[PDB]
């Protein structure tokens, strides 16, 4: 029934206390309430310390707040290998200890930061130690994969062509939010130039709200995670669907909120609103599953998914006739009471798996090589316990990621 | 985390002076006060450079290394002076000649044993030691030799924690000292051998970036060194500050060295507008980046400009839009996409902290691994060989116990380290 | 120019049935095919190929060589189980089951008493380990570090490295059993030898023109690189697993550039570790090198031998 979540790099878990934020939000429970089902993994003592500071501050249990007051390293090796591994025992006893107390769960919702030193290493394992762990379970791991053009990290493939290999074989589907391509949606969707990181964090956070928080939660057409991973992934490749949200108006300037169904689905396919620098370049939709939420008519749906599926500029797979998994809540969404979130009365959270994704794929294993092909940061991981294996053969890995979201 | 800084020779001393001076105020602590921080952040993670013994008494956690009396003793004479633990004065009152052979081999060498003994007193402080930061002059004993041994040993010790070294690189236009190349290219090569993070400023590099970039007429000592002492502590100190993306010395390690020679950075801070006038505030960010990427104002004395870069550090402290810094730093990377080396697909490692230099909204710390510096290794092997190749003021190191194959060393050294640089 | 030749070990009856199984299929003499793989390179040693088959090809040329006064490299590598112990060394006396540096030593002293008239031979032997990136001297083990010098031409040698002189061939035996027995080798089961500490073996061949006085000094370095391995996790072992994976790892990148610059590219990475200070004579001025990959079948071997594919591979393609 329930969902444990595991969130991971200081990323991870400023995404964890937004999305963690908009939770009570919508259930009524303010500071000092209940107790979360999560917990927050960090080799930085430091940003941790900011849910232990500031805001949701006791919302928390010491105990479901791991740090290692060490080091960081924005490099993959030390953060799985050498340093992360220390911590994860500590790491998993929470959620062994997390997962007993609970009641017939369903699975761990991931939260990592794909190119970091915390986010991507050490997660490689945890999400390692899990799959073994708990087989019988699901393991989404929602991440944040760098940024196409306005990466951070110098290294940032390394580290994520590192968390791909090692997690590949051990998620169950993984969603994707693409930094970058979200501040489009700042600018171009919702008008601001001054957007904080903890901007993009009450985005996700939103888009995850409608995966979990409302899910789990009763409605007209209830969609469990199971259910997103048989109706999401074709195939054992932890396949990664993308996320998009659909009233991302501002709550200020324009206002035509009541944008009928008909409007807000159409409104998720457009390149431009997706949360990911994937812009649908050729890559076929193999499965969607359109979460709504608010008022919406089943038919209101069955019709303007109908008008979608004869749009054929919208091309789905051949070996898929119907890839449409219609996920419909009662309770609308819920906005931040003064962030900058428009706030109406109907939302889509479509996700999907796209073979657009060949692209951003290719693209950041290309970035790789460039560095790999001269060794650049290499003496920063071989000294940290990996080895030319390691890179050469989780480059391999991806190469036959590349061929696969290109085949299938 | 934490650190233990090392103020070898007079120069690193004098230095040590400003960047306690600063550091200091950017943590609330007077004199022998406390903290007053005008803040409570400004002391969840003190501790990084200091130690708790009475309860308003946190101690600079540093050593002061040199064989002349009379500097330490206008370091301890002064202001901030009395706040050191006399322990920390490792001093030798012997005669600090100016010489690298004397400093490393002769008087030195002897000083080291009673240095190390407190290195190791405040590496076991407690909780977990990352690395040591090092101010010193490559032009005199007590810099080059003494301090460039410190670390040779300090290496030995930990080959796990880090090693940032902050040298003043003999200027170029004019030597403060004659025999500069020789005390130099001596300490530059124990560099590329131990420490794994080198900061060069240049005495030059700073008065015409201290003149021009601050109609400052009179730049004194204090104020050069004041302001390199401004970007050590952008660098350190503020990444263990929090931070939307927070980096630390490892980070800014493992993301700046490509090849394990060590290299030399150079660091360059943001808002540097004269007082009055100057407070344009134009600051919203592209200002910070227009700044910092600029030649002038850096640190260094080459300029970026003349070579590529392999990595750039943009550590970033005050509030901003992970997206309008994110976002610059890539334009950035186009419109000079020539020099930027290209098998690093993102050179720049954008960091991002959030409270900024007490007193100032928004600042960013540079810190640029470019091949251009091999113009300046070059110059330094240069100024040797023309002297080297007459022994010049050789009987002062020879006499002092040396080798006439220790000097062709380094230089080989340091000399094939302008090589490699050029590979890239 | 560097050639790469792969050496793979034969399994014995006893772990035919185990559970290691063969996985290298071999076309013709020169490819080896794993999984995904259409041409190897220069040359692939069958496990039907002789210990005498092997040093014909890569050794007997550099030897000839080192005797007119050039310098020749051997390097070795290969995990644990690889075949490395047999290759090199072998049984110290055996008359074909013996390795390169038994051979060597044999060749060496048919030519001395026989050509020697005008030639007065000094062979010295010096044995050294680089372990924590510190060189240790293998005939005083007390010795922790030992430092380099540079030479005549600013080329850099191994200052007071122990040499000693070797007339016959026992005397070269009894160098090998002293420096083996203080070796960090893993306390493993009796069967492996878990090599964390690389080893480096100089022949020195000196002769001297007693005519004229003309010394010639050829260098054959036997370098056995231990090698980057596939082992378990770290980060809560103390083992010598997180020291070894320091070191290998080192000495292995430091291998792919200097592959690569052999096979083409600016000069770079000399001076940078000990390991690269002692080959500095073998590398760059006229030398020859020969790498000797091992790799026997059990599965995990799979992994090493990739890496010396790799080594090879990269640079010719
Ligand atoms: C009224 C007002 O706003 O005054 C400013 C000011 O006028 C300017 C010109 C300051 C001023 O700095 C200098 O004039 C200067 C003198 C010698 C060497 C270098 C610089 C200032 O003195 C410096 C001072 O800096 C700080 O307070 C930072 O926290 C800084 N502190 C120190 O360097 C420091 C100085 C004395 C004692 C202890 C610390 C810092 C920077 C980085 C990391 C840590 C601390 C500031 C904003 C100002 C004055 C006071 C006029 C500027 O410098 C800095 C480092 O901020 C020079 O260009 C900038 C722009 C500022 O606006
Ligand atoms: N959306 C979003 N992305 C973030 C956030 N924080 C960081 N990121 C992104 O995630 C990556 C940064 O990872 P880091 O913060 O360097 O590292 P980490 O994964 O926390 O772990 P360490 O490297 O060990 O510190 C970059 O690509 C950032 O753009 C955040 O709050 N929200
Ligand atoms: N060609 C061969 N014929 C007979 N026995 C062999 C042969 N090659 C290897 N062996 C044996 O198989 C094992 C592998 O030996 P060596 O001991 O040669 O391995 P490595 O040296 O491959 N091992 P390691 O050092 O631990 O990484 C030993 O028991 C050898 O005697
Ligand atoms: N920035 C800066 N440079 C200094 C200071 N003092 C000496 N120097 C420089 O250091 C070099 C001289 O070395 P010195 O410090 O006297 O050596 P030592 O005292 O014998 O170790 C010259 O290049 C000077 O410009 C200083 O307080 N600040
Ligand atoms: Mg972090
Ligand atoms: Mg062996």
């Given at each position: 029934?329930?969902?444990?979540?595991?969130?991971?790099?200081?990323?991870?878990?400023?995404?964890?206390?937004?999305?963690?934020?908009?939770?009570?939000?919508?259930?009524?429970?303010?500071?000092?309430?209940?107790?979360?089902?999560?917990?927050?993994?960090?080799?930085?003592?430091?940003?941790?310390?900011?849910?232990?500071?500031?805001?949701?501050?006791?919302?928390?249990?010491?105990?479901?707040?791991?740090?290692?007051?060490?080091?960081?390293?924005?490099?993959?090796?030390?953060?799985?290998?050498?340093?992360?591994?220390?911590?994860?025992?500590?790491?998993?006893?929470?959620?062994?200890?997390?997962?007993?107390?609970?009641?017939?769960?369903?699975?761990?919702?991931?939260?990592?930061?794909?190119?970091?030193?915390?986010?991507?290493?050490?997660?490689?394992?945890?999400?390692?130690?899990?799959?073994?762990?708990?087989?019988?379970?699901?393991?989404?791991?929602?991440?944040?994969?760098?940024?196409?053009?306005?990466?951070?990290?110098?290294?940032?493939?390394?580290?994520?062509?590192?968390?791909?290999?090692?997690?590949?074989?051990?998620?169950?589907?993984?969603?994707?939010?693409?930094?970058?391509?979200?501040?489009?949606?700042?600018?171009?969707?919702?008008?601001?130039?001054?957007?904080?990181?903890?901007?993009?964090?009450?985005?996700?956070?939103?888009?995850?709200?409608?995966?979990?928080?409302?899910?789990?939660?009763?409605?007209?057409?209830?969609?469990?995670?199971?259910?997103?991973?048989?109706?999401?992934?074709?195939?054992?490749?932890?396949?990664?669907?993308?996320?998009?949200?659909?009233?991302?108006?501002?709550?200020?300037?324009?206002?035509?909120?009541?944008?009928?169904?008909?409007?807000?689905?159409?409104?998720?396919?457009?390149?431009?609103?997706?949360?990911?620098?994937?812009?649908?370049?050729?890559?076929?939709?193999?499965?969607?599953?359109?979460?709504?939420?608010?008022?919406?008519?089943?038919?209101?749906?069955?019709?303007?998914?109908?008008?979608?599926?004869?749009?054929?500029?919208?091309?789905?797979?051949?070996?898929?006739?119907?890839?449409?998994?219609?996920?419909?809540?009662?309770?609308?969404?819920?906005?931040?009471?003064?962030?900058?979130?428009?706030?109406?009365?109907?939302?889509?959270?479509?996700?999907?798996?796209?073979?657009?994704?060949?692209?951003?794929?290719?693209?950041?294993?290309?970035?790789?090589?460039?560095?790999?092909?001269?060794?650049?940061?290499?003496?920063?991981?071989?000294?940290?316990?990996?080895?030319?294996?390691?890179?050469?053969?989780?480059?391999?890995?991806?190469?036959?990621?590349?061929?696969?979201?290109?085949?299938? | 985390?934490?650190?233990?800084?090392?103020?070898?020779?007079?120069?690193?001393?004098?230095?040590?002076?400003?960047?306690?001076?600063?550091?200091?105020?950017?943590?609330?602590?007077?004199?022998?006060?406390?903290?007053?921080?005008?803040?409570?952040?400004?002391?969840?993670?003190?501790?990084?450079?200091?130690?708790?013994?009475?309860?308003?008494?946190?101690?600079?956690?540093?050593?002061?290394?040199?064989?002349?009396?009379?500097?330490?003793?206008?370091?301890?004479?002064?202001?901030?002076?009395?706040?050191?633990?006399?322990?920390?004065?490792?001093?030798?009152?012997?005669?600090?000649?100016?010489?690298?052979?004397?400093?490393?081999?002769?008087?030195?060498?002897?000083?080291?044993?009673?240095?190390?003994?407190?290195?190791?007193?405040?590496?076991?402080?407690?909780?977990?030691?990352?690395?040591?930061?090092?101010?010193?002059?490559?032009?005199?004993?007590?810099?080059?030799?003494?301090?460039?041994?410190?670390?040779?040993?300090?290496?030995?010790?930990?080959?796990?924690?880090?090693?940032?070294?902050?040298?003043?690189?003999?200027?170029?236009?004019?030597?403060?000292?004659?025999?500069?190349?020789?005390?130099?290219?001596?300490?530059?090569?124990?560099?590329?051998?131990?420490?794994?993070?080198?900061?060069?400023?240049?005495?030059?590099?700073?008065?015409?970036?201290?003149?021009?970039?601050?109609?400052?007429?009179?730049?004194?000592?204090?104020?050069?060194?004041?302001?390199?002492?401004?970007?050590?502590?952008?660098?350190?100190?503020?990444?263990?500050?929090?931070?939307?993306?927070?980096?630390?010395?490892?980070?800014?390690?493992?993301?700046?060295?490509?090849?394990?020679?060590?290299?030399?950075?150079?660091?360059?801070?943001?808002?540097?507008?004269?007082?009055?006038?100057?407070?344009?505030?134009?600051?919203?960010?592209?200002?910070?980046?227009?700044?910092?990427?600029?030649?002038?104002?850096?640190?260094?004395?080459?300029?970026?400009?003349?070579?590529?870069?392999?990595?750039?550090?943009?550590?970033?402290?005050?509030?901003?839009?992970?997206?309008?810094?994110?976002?610059?730093?890539?334009?950035?990377?186009?419109?000079?996409?020539?020099?930027?080396?290209?098998?690093?697909?993102?050179?720049?490692?954008?960091?991002?902290?959030?409270?900024?230099?007490?007193?100032?909204?928004?600042?960013?710390?540079?810190?640029?691994?470019?091949?251009?510096?091999?113009?300046?290794?070059?110059?330094?092997?240069?100024?040797?060989?023309?002297?080297?190749?007459?022994?010049?003021?050789?009987?002062?190191?020879?006499?002092?116990?040396?080798?006439?194959?220790?000097?062709?060393?380094?230089?080989?050294?340091?000399?094939?380290?302008?090589?490699?640089?050029?590979?890239? | 120019?560097?050639?790469?030749?792969?050496?793979?070990?034969?399994?014995?009856?006893?772990?035919?049935?185990?559970?290691?199984?063969?996985?290298?299929?071999?076309?013709?003499?020169?490819?080896?095919?794993?999984?995904?793989?259409?041409?190897?390179?220069?040359?692939?040693?069958?496990?039907?190929?002789?210990?005498?088959?092997?040093?014909?090809?890569?050794?007997?040329?550099?030897?000839?060589?080192?005797?007119?006064?050039?310098?020749?490299?051997?390097?070795?590598?290969?995990?644990?189980?690889?075949?490395?112990?047999?290759?090199?060394?072998?049984?110290?006396?055996?008359?074909?089951?013996?390795?390169?540096?038994?051979?060597?030593?044999?060749?060496?002293?048919?030519?001395?008493?026989?050509?020697?008239?005008?030639?007065?031979?000094?062979?010295?032997?010096?044995?050294?380990?680089?372990?924590?990136?510190?060189?240790?001297?293998?005939?005083?083990?007390?010795?922790?570090?030992?430092?380099?010098?540079?030479?005549?031409?600013?080329?850099?040698?191994?200052?007071?490295?122990?040499?000693?002189?070797?007339?016959?061939?026992?005397?070269?035996?009894?160098?090998?059993?002293?420096?083996?027995?203080?070796?960090?080798?893993?306390?493993?089961?009796?069967?492996?030898?878990?090599?964390?500490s690389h080893s480096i073996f100089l022949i020195n061949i000196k002769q001297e023109n007693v005519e004229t006085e003309k010394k010639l000094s050829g260098k054959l370095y036997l370098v056995d690189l231990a090698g980057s391995e596939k082992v378990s996790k770290t980060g809560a072992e103390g083992a010598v697993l997180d020291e070894a994976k320091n070191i290998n790892k080192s000495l292995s990148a430091l291998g792919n550039?200097?592959?690569?610059?052999?096979?083409?590219?600016?000069?770079?990475?000399?001076?940078?570790?000990?390991?690269?200070?002692?080959?500095?004579?073998?590398?760059?001025?006229?030398?020859?090198?020969?790498?000797?990959?091992?790799?026997?079948?059990?599965?995990?071997?799979?992994?090493?031998?990739?890496?010396?594919?790799?080594?090879?591979?990269?640079?010719?393609?």
């Amino acid at each position: 029934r329930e969902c444990i979540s595991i969130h991971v790099g200081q990323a991870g878990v400023q995404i964890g206390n937004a999305c963690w934020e908009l939770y009570c939000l919508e259930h009524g429970i303010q500071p000092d309430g209940h107790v979360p089902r999560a917990v927050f993994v960090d080799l930085e003592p430091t940003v941790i310390d900011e849910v232990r500071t500031g805001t949701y501050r006791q919302l928390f249990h010491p105990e479901q707040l791991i740090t290692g007051k060490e080091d960081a390293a924005n490099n993959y090796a030390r953060g799985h290998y050498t340093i992360g591994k220390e911590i994860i025992d500590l790491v998993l006893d929470r959620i062994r200890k997390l997962a007993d107390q609970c009641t017939g769960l369903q699975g761990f919702s991931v939260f990592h930061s794909f190119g970091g030193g915390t986010g991507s290493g050490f997660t490689s394992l945890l999400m390692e130690r899990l799959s073994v762990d708990y087989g019988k379970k699901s393991k989404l791991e929602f991440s944040i994969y760098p940024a196409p053009q306005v990466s951070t990290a110098v290294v940032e493939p390394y580290n994520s062509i590192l968390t791909t290999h090692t997690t590949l074989e051990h998620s169950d589907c993984a969603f994707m939010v693409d930094n970058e391509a979200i501040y489009d949606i700042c600018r171009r969707n919702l008008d601001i130039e001054r957007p904080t990181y903890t901007n993009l964090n009450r985005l996700i956070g939103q888009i995850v709200s409608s995966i979990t928080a409302s899910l789990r939660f009763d409605g007209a057409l209830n969609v469990d995670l199971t259910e997103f991973q048989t109706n999401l992934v074709p195939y054992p490749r932890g396949h990664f669907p993308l996320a998009t949200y659909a009233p991302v108006i501002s709550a200020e300037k324009a206002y035509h909120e009541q944008l009928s169904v008909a409007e807000i689905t159409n409104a998720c396919f457009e390149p431009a609103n997706q949360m990911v620098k994937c812009d649908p370049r050729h890559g076929k939709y193999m499965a969607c599953c359109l979460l709504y939420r608010g008022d919406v008519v089943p038919k209101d749906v069955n019709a303007a998914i109908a008008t979608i599926k004869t749009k054929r500029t919208i091309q789905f797979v051949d070996w898929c006739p119907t890839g449409f998994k219609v996920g419909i809540n009662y309770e609308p969404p819920t906005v931040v009471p003064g962030g900058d979130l428009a706030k109406v009365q109907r939302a889509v959270c479509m996700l999907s798996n796209t073979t657009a994704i060949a692209e951003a794929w290719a693209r950041l294993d290309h970035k790789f090589d460039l560095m790999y092909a001269k060794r650049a940061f290499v003496h920063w991981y071989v000294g940290e316990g990996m080895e030319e294996g390691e890179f050469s053969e989780a480059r391999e890995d991806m190469a036959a990621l590349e061929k696969d979201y290109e085949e299938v | 985390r934490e650190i233990v800084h090392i103020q070898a020779g007079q120069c690193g001393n004098q230095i040590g002076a400003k960047f306690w001076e600063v550091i200091s105020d950017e943590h609330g602590i007077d004199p022998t006060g406390s903290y007053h921080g005008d803040s409570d952040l400004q002391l969840e993670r003190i501790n990084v450079y200091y130690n708790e013994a009475a309860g308003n008494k946190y101690v600079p956690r540093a050593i002061l290394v040199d064989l002349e009396p009379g500097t330490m003793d206008s370091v301890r004479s002064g202001p901030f002076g009395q706040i050191f633990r006399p322990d920390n004065f490792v001093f030798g009152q012997s005669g600090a000649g100016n010489n690298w052979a004397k400093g490393h081999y002769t008087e030195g060498a002897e000083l080291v044993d009673s240095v190390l003994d407190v290195v190791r007193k405040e590496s076991e402080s407690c909780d977990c030691l990352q690395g040591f930061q090092l101010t010193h002059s490559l032009g005199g004993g007590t810099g080059s030799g003494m301090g460039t041994l410190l670390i040779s040993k300090i290496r030995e010790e930990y080959p796990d924690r880090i090693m940032n070294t902050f040298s003043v690189v003999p200027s170029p236009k004019v030597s403060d000292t004659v025999v500069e190349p020789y005390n130099a290219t001596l300490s530059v090569h124990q560099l590329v051998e131990n420490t794994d993070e080198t900061y060069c400023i240049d005495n030059e590099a700073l008065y015409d970036i201290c003149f021009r970039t601050l109609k400052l007429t009179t730049p004194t000592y204090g104020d050069l060194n004041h302001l390199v002492s401004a970007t050590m502590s952008g660098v350190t100190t503020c990444l263990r500050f929090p931070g939307q993306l927070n980096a630390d010395l490892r980070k800014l390690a493992v993301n700046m060295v490509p090849f394990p020679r060590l290299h030399f950075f150079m660091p360059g801070f943001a808002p540097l507008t004269s007082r009055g006038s100057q407070q344009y505030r134009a600051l919203t960010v592209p200002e910070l980046t227009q700044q910092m990427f600029d030649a002038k104002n850096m640190m260094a004395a080459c300029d970026p400009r003349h070579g590529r870069y392999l990595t750039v550090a943009a550590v970033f402290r005050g509030r901003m839009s992970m997206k309008e810094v994110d976002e610059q730093m890539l334009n950035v990377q186009n419109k000079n996409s020539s020099y930027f080396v290209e098998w690093i697909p993102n050179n720049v490692k954008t960091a991002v902290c959030d409270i900024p230099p007490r007193g100032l909204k928004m600042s960013a710390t540079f810190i640029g691994n470019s091949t251009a510096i091999q113009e300046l290794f070059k110059r330094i092997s240069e100024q040797f060989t023309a002297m080297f190749r007459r022994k010049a003021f050789l009987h002062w190191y020879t006499g002092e116990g040396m080798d006439e194959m220790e000097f062709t060393e380094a230089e080989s050294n340091m000399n094939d380290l302008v090589s490699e640089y050029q590979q890239y | 120019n560097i050639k790469v030749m792969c050496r793979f070990r034969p399994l014995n009856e006893a772990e035919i049935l185990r559970g290691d199984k063969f996985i290298p299929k071999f076309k013709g003499e020169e490819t080896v095919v794993i999984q995904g793989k259409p041409y190897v390179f220069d040359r692939v040693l069958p496990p039907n190929t002789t210990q005498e088959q092997v040093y014909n090809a890569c050794a007997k040329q550099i030897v000839k060589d080192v005797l007119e006064g050039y310098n020749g490299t051997i390097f070795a590598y290969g995990q644990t189980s690889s075949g490395k112990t047999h290759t090199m060394e072998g049984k110290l006396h055996d008359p074909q089951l013996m390795g390169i540096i038994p051979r060597i030593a044999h060749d060496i002293f048919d030519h001395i008493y026989s050509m020697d008239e005008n030639l007065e031979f000094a062979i010295k032997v010096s044995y050294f380990e680089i372990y924590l990136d510190k060189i240790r001297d293998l005939l005083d083990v007390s010795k922790t570090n030992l430092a380099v010098h540079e030479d005549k031409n600013r080329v850099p040698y191994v200052k007071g490295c122990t040499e000693r002189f070797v007339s016959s061939p026992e005397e070269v035996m009894d160098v090998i059993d002293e420096g083996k027995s203080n070796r960090h080798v893993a306390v493993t089961n009796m069967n492996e030898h878990s090599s964390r500490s690389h080893s480096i073996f100089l022949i020195n061949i000196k002769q001297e023109n007693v005519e004229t006085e003309k010394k010639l000094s050829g260098k054959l370095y036997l370098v056995d690189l231990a090698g980057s391995e596939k082992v378990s996790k770290t980060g809560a072992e103390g083992a010598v697993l997180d020291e070894a994976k320091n070191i290998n790892k080192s000495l292995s990148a430091l291998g792919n550039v200097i592959s690569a610059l052999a096979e083409g590219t600016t000069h770079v990475p000399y001076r940078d570790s000990k390991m690269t200070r002692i080959l500095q004579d073998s590398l760059g001025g006229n030398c020859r090198t020969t790498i000797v990959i091992c790799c026997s079948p059990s599965v995990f071997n799979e992994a090493e031998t990739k890496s010396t594919l790799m080594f090879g591979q990269r640079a010719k393609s």
